[PDB]
Structures are given as C-alpha cells and as structure tokens.
Design a protein around this ligand. Structure first.
Ligand SMILES: [Zn+2]
Length: 43
C-alpha cells in the first residue's frame, strides 16, 4: 500500500536522540526535524 516513510527517525544535531520517528521536534531538546536529518523528496 502507501509508504510516506516520514516515520524514518531523525538523529538530533544537539541532544543526538533516536526519537519516536514521527516527532516534529525532539521530546526533550525540542529541535525541529526540518533543522535535522532531511528525507526523500516527498511532502
Ligand atoms: Zn534534539
């Protein structure tokens, strides 16, 4: 079926955490995912 693959995690640039893969911001540091690991061309 579908596969957005937005739930693909993102390693933070400050706290460096493995998050809930769907987080817009880190659970403790609160850095934006847009300011972290970029994904495949798909909004
Ligand atoms: Zn963070």
């Amino acid at each position: 079926g579908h596969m957005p693959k937005i739930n693909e995690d993102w390693l933070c640039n400050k706290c460096g955490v493995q998050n809930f893969k769907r987080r817009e911001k880190c659970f403790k540091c609160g850095v934006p995912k847009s300011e972290a690991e970029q994904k495949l061309p798909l909004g």
